[PDB]
Amino acid sequence: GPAQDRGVYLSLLASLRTRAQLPVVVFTFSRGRCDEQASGLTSLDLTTSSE
RNA sequence: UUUUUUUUUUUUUUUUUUUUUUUUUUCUCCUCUUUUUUUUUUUU
Known part of the structure; x- marks a missing residue:
């Protein structure tokens, strides 16, 4: 679903x-x-401040 | 629920020269009447 595919994205990107x-x-x-995949997440911040 | 690949604006430049206005025709051709020829001279 539109709000449930995001759940899959934030499930795989968690474990x-x-x-x-x-x-x-x-x-x-x-x-x-x-x-569309990248546009609808908007929050991963997987970067250190030095890099 | 619609992916991947299909080049572009020709190359060249570091060659010598000792002439001279023009330019080229037109044939022979009946002259009518007072004359010898007047004349110095002086006033510029």
């Missing part, structure tokens, strides 16, 4: 950032919805 496999590649199969 994987704790461990060492934080670099992740998502193979979206559409040029259109690829930007």
Whole structure:
């Protein structure tokens, strides 16, 4: 769902950032919805202030 | 619920020269009447 797919995004990006496999590649199969995935999350901040 | 790939505006430049206005035709051709020829001279 529109508000439940975000739940999937914040589920997979939760049980994987704790461990060492934080670099992740998502193979979206559409040029259109690829930007839609990133647009509707808006909060990951997975960067240190030095980098 | 619609991915991936399909080049672009020709290359070249560091060659010598010792002439001179023009330019080229037109043929022979009946002259009518007072004359010898007047004349110095002086006033500029």
